[PDB]
Amino acid sequence: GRMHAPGKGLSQSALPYRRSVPTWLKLTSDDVKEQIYKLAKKGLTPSQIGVILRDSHGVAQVRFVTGNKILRILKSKGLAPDLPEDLYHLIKKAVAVRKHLERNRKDKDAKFRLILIESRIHRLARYYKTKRVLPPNWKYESSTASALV
Amino acid sequence: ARGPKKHLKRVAAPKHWMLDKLTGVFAPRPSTGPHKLRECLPLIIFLRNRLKYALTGDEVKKICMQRFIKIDGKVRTDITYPAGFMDVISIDKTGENFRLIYDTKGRFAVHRITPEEAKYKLCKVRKIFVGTKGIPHLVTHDARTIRYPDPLIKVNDTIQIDLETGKITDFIKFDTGNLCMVTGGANLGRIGVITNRERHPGSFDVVHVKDANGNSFATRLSNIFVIGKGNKPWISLPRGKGIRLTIAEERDKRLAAKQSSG
Amino acid sequence: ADIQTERAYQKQPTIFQNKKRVLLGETGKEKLPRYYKNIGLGFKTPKEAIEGTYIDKKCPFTGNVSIRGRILSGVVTKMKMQRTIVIRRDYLHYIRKYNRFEKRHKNMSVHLSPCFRDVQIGDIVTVGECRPLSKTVRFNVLKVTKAAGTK
Amino acid sequence: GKCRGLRTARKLRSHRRDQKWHDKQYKKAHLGTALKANPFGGASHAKGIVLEKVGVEAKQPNSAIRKCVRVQLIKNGKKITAFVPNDGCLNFIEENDEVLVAGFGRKGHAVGDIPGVRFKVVKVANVSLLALYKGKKERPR
Amino acid sequence: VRMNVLADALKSINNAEKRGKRQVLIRPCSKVIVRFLTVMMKHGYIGEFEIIDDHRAGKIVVNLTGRLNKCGVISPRFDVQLKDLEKWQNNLLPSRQFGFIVLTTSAGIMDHEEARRKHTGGKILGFFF
RNA sequence: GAAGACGGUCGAACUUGACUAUCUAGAGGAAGUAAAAGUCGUAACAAGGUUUCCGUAGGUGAACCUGCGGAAGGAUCAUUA
RNA sequence: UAAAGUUGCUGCAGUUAAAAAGCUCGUAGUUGGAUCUCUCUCGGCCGAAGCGUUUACUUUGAAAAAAUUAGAGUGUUCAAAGCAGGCCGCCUGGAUACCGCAGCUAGGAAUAAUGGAAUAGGACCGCGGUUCUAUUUUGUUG
RNA sequence: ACGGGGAAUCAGGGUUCGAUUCCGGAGAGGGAGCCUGAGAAACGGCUACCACAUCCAAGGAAGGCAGCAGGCGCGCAAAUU
């Protein structure tokens, strides 16, 4: 179930058994990489890049075509964000709820949700510091959270 | 506490003396000497408990004070004198000589030797050092200091010394293929040929030994006492030739001996 | 990089540094002979010990100590003492009734010679037993292994 | 449920050690408060001086008068009421004499219909109550 | 969360045998699960099984011969010495005539009789009878 | 080279200051515990005759009563386009 | 102490019998998914030499006092015991096992673990370019 | 609470005990300080203080049974100068 909710959902993608490039894909690996670079230059996260490639151009999985994941490709050329995208979005949500709570001090549900969001941020940041994705002294603070977003 | 102890409780005595618990509270505390307290045999134990020449310690005292007992060619009047491995006990009045050799069960056997073999003994050397104007020295398991030894004699080798003159006659190097005896531990009393030595720097070395019947055992290097060059011994072995029998074969031999002899 | 930072002169007691020299054959500080030894058990002398200049009478390589006894290991946890560090040794102790183990640890204050520079908190260090060097110190760092999570 | 891990020995041991204090017998035998409150002080028997004879009424379901003696122990000076077991045995006891008193058989608990009495007289004047009862011995003069 | 996939596999097999079914679907599969099933099948308790290969973690469909009374896991996997094996068999097995304790030893995963034949102790995985 | 305060050391002791936990003395006050239809006087158990109980507040000549919120362990598993 | 599966590791119980915290985060603790099958010297099967990624196991091999306990033998008149006992001077015994954990040693690598290349800051090759040279030479030392 | 060897049921696991004859430690009424000696902070050695206590002609002198026996005391609880 969810880490911070009582829900137990089964919604997630079901990757097909075949790991091959589809027959309809006339796009070679290098064109896919170039489109990935262009989409990243437009200011899009790897999730958005994958969504656009799956939706408009038609790419079942970038890994099955280019052999590398989108974030790995971005890091290889060097276009990746300094901090990971999921951590960045969690920090963004924390900043949003903290800004809301300033003018809504009576919103005691917002305070609880902010506590849950910051717990998620701390867990993810600890994991990233374990794998050296973040500097060992990387700390999240309320007064500095909007400085990272 | 407060200086050395002078008594030995009978139950704290070495188990290879085969002392019984109902005789007394005390065991003969062996005097200081060339052999350690736990791996020696006091003269009273040999003269009374083994040879049965005396019934009490007073009779052992009478025998010893009659200057009848010679250990390594020297008359010893101390009844608790520690006699140990390879020590020669010569009783001239009765004309028999014994050599203290471990039996295969880890105990000093009553091993009678000819008077020709009572004129020498084998001594494992413990250290070699140079002192007093570049004069090499040699310390044995018998606490004997022999000056001017052969330069080829190194530690863990065993020399042969004549008892009358106290000088080195021959020596055996410590090497694979040489016959050896185990003087301590579980395999104490066993005789076999050295097959392999494992060196553990900073710790104890391990020597692997194989019997005549192919049984292989191991012990620490300090417990190895090489007897002869190759597989032949330089001294006479006890009734058992260093072979340790399993309890099954021991029982089988005992039953066969009971059957044959009536 | 002064070595004489104490009230008494610091020097290796074995090395004599007052030998007569030759004027026409000397231009600048020629050499100061360095005393070092190789400790046993296959431990290689670090380069910084052989070509260094530090004076450490408790150094296993350039000092008066002899390594003998237990060879242990641990992870560095504190480096707030002069030439001495605190290492932690973790182990599992068996409880027979429950057939299970419990985590336990012991901190050992060990001497770290200046031949081991840039040792970090979390590194695995191999220590050797020596004579009492202080009230609590009985081991000397013999080899420093960089942690897997290092640069 | 209980924890089942290879490294849970400390948790299991500490939980058992803490839960043992919720055992009545364990707490009684290890807290030491029941020991200081015990007039005998951990002893099986004690000697006391008979202060007076008292008759305690039996508990409600049955009616009788239980012949007891109030005794003061010599070791600690504590006051004790002890049952004199057999019949006529109260006549073998005189005021202000030494008696050997034991427990009543339930380890500090009252026994039977006698209320609040957990001690019984074994010997009086250094002769057993049974020898006096059976006539094997007479009271010393 | 799901830990000890072997426990789930054995519980599913036991539950399907209680219900009287002829086949049970086990997921996720694992090497230890396959070895335990092979030890079971060599003794005639479980019969043939097929490993379905999905590209993440296999599933196994196990035919069920009605011969199995109980299969269980032992958690944690206690280290068992050859001298403590008899106590484990007395604790776990219905009798000395039938029933097996499955150990994992450096010689592989096998039952207690084979582990005594090969003179190996190991870690207890489970049992079946 | 044979007695005795003194740059001193180890240091039992000894009075004086706080007034230290295992120990004891009095009329006390509050409470608990053992069977006792103890001088008009019933809270609960049935809808116990005001349904019971929980938390929290008052008040009482006693069980107790009352207000607020809650529970059914209720005396309703149900009440109709 | 057993009975007490009424202290439950084996092995208890927690709706109503005693009992799950009002609720949710959370650090330590505990637990954790699949997945890897002229490197080396005397004579064309040998000691040395091992960073195999340290380990945890498992199985050995040493070292672990005696007495006690288990246990072998031995008619104390039997037994508890003891370490002792015959044959018209000789034969023997005075064993063995176990001795937790932690240290020491040795196969195969199932199974908590630990993952050695990811800004490549990753074996092997030709360059010795100022240096130590079988602790520089190899007719009477240059 | 001296520690250990070890002791009290056998299902398996455990729970209790170990002052006690073997090993190690400590102490000799309580502390402290020493001489001799290889070895003692020794007490069947010494020197003090503290607590007890013996003879005295009242000046002084002499003490240390948790050694074997024996007494008293304490006790539910343990032997022959």
Swiss-Prot record, chain A:
Its main location: cytoplasm. GO terms for molecular function: mRNA 5'-UTR binding; mRNA binding; RNA binding; small ribosomal subunit rRNA binding; structural constituent of ribosome. The modification Phosphotyrosine is found at Y37. There is a cross-link at K42 (Glycyl lysine isopeptide (Lys-Gly) (interchain with G-Cter in SUMO2)). The modification N6-succinyllysine is found at K26, K33. SMART domains: Ribosomal_S13_N, Ribosomal_S15. The keyword Ubl conjugation applies. The modification Phosphoserine is found at S29. There is a cross-link at K26 (Glycyl lysine isopeptide (Lys-Gly) (interchain with G-Cter in ubiquitin)). GO terms for cellular component: cytoplasm; cytosol; cytosolic ribosome; cytosolic small ribosomal subunit; extracellular exosome; focal adhesion; membrane; nucleolus. PROSITE patterns: RIBOSOMAL_S15. The modification N6-acetyllysine is found at K26. Ubiquitinated at Lys-26 by RNF14 and RNF25 in response to ribosome collisions (ribosome stalling). Keywords: Acetylation, Cytoplasm, Isopeptide bond, Nucleus, Phosphoprotein, Ribonucleoprotein, Ribosomal protein, Ubl conjugation. GO terms for biological process: cytoplasmic translation; negative regulation of RNA splicing; ribosomal small subunit biogenesis; translation. HAMAP family: Ribosomal_uS15_A (MF_01343_A). This is Small ribosomal subunit protein uS15. The gene is RPS13.
UniProtKB/Swiss-Prot annotation, chain B:
Component of the small ribosomal subunit. Part of the small subunit (SSU) processome, composed of more than 70 proteins and the RNA chaperone small nucleolar RNA (snoRNA) U3. Identified in a IGF2BP1-dependent mRNP granule complex containing untranslated mRNAs. The modification N6-acetyllysine is found at K232. Keywords: Acetylation, Cytoplasm, Isopeptide bond, Nucleus, Ribonucleoprotein, Ribosomal protein, RNA-binding, rRNA-binding, Ubl conjugation. Residues 41-103 form the S4 RNA-binding domain. InterPro entries: KOW (IPR005824), Rib_uL2_dom2 (IPR014722), Ribosomal_eS4 (IPR000876), Ribosomal_eS4_C (IPR032277), Ribosomal_eS4_central_region (IPR013845), Ribosomal_eS4_central_sf (IPR038237), Ribosomal_eS4_KOW (IPR041982), Ribosomal_eS4_N (IPR013843). GO terms for molecular function: RNA binding; rRNA binding; structural constituent of ribosome. It comes from the Eukaryota. GO terms for cellular component: cytoplasmic ribonucleoprotein granule; cytosol; cytosolic ribosome; cytosolic small ribosomal subunit; extracellular exosome; focal adhesion; membrane; nucleolus. SMART domains: S4. The gene is RPS4X. There is a cross-link at K229 (Glycyl lysine isopeptide (Lys-Gly) (interchain with G-Cter in SUMO2)). Disulfide bonds: none annotated. This is Small ribosomal subunit protein eS4, X isoform. Belongs to the eukaryotic ribosomal protein eS4 family.
From Swiss-Prot, chain D:
It is linked to Brachycephaly, trichomegaly, and developmental delay: An autosomal dominant developmental disorder characterized by brachycephaly, ciliary trichomegaly, dysmorphic features of the face and hands, hearing loss, and developmental delay with short stature. Intellectual disability and autism spectrum disorder may be present in some patients. GO terms for biological process: cytoplasmic translation; maintenance of translational fidelity; ribosomal small subunit biogenesis; stress granule assembly; translation. CDD domains: Ribosomal_S23. The lineage of its organism: Eukaryota, Metazoa, Chordata, Craniata, Vertebrata. It is found in: Cytoplasm, Cytosol; Cytoplasm; Rough endoplasmic reticulum; Nucleus, Nucleolus. Coiled coil: none annotated. This is Small ribosomal subunit protein uS12. Hydroxylation at Pro-61 affects translation termination efficiency. Component of the 40S small ribosomal subunit. Part of the small subunit (SSU) processome, composed of more than 70 proteins and the RNA chaperone small nucleolar RNA (snoRNA) U3. Residues 1-25 are annotated as: Disordered. Its main location: cytoplasm.
UniProtKB/Swiss-Prot annotation, chain E:
One of its GO terms (cellular component) is cytosolic small ribosomal subunit. One of its GO terms (molecular function) is structural constituent of ribosome. Its main location: cytoplasm. Keywords: Cytoplasm, Diamond-Blackfan anemia, Nucleus, Ribonucleoprotein, Ribosomal protein. Pfam families: Ribosomal_S8. The modification N6-succinyllysine is found at K87. One of its GO terms (biological process) is response to virus. InterPro entries: Ribosomal_uS8, Ribosomal_uS8_CS, Ribosomal_uS8_sf. PROSITE patterns: RIBOSOMAL_S8. It is found in: Cytoplasm; Nucleus, Nucleolus. Component of the small ribosomal subunit. Part of the small subunit (SSU) processome, first precursor of the small eukaryotic ribosomal subunit. During the assembly of the SSU processome in the nucleolus, many ribosome biogenesis factors, an RNA chaperone and ribosomal proteins associate with the nascent pre-rRNA and work in concert to generate RNA folding, modifications, rearrangements and cleavage as well as targeted degradation of pre-ribosomal RNA by the RNA exosome. Required for proper erythropoiesis. PANTHER family: 40S RIBOSOMAL PROTEIN S15A (PTHR11758). Belongs to the universal ribosomal protein uS8 family. Component of the 40S ribosomal subunit. Part of the small subunit (SSU) processome, composed of more than 70 proteins and the RNA chaperone small nucleolar RNA (snoRNA) U3. This is Small ribosomal subunit protein uS8. It comes from Homo sapiens (Human).
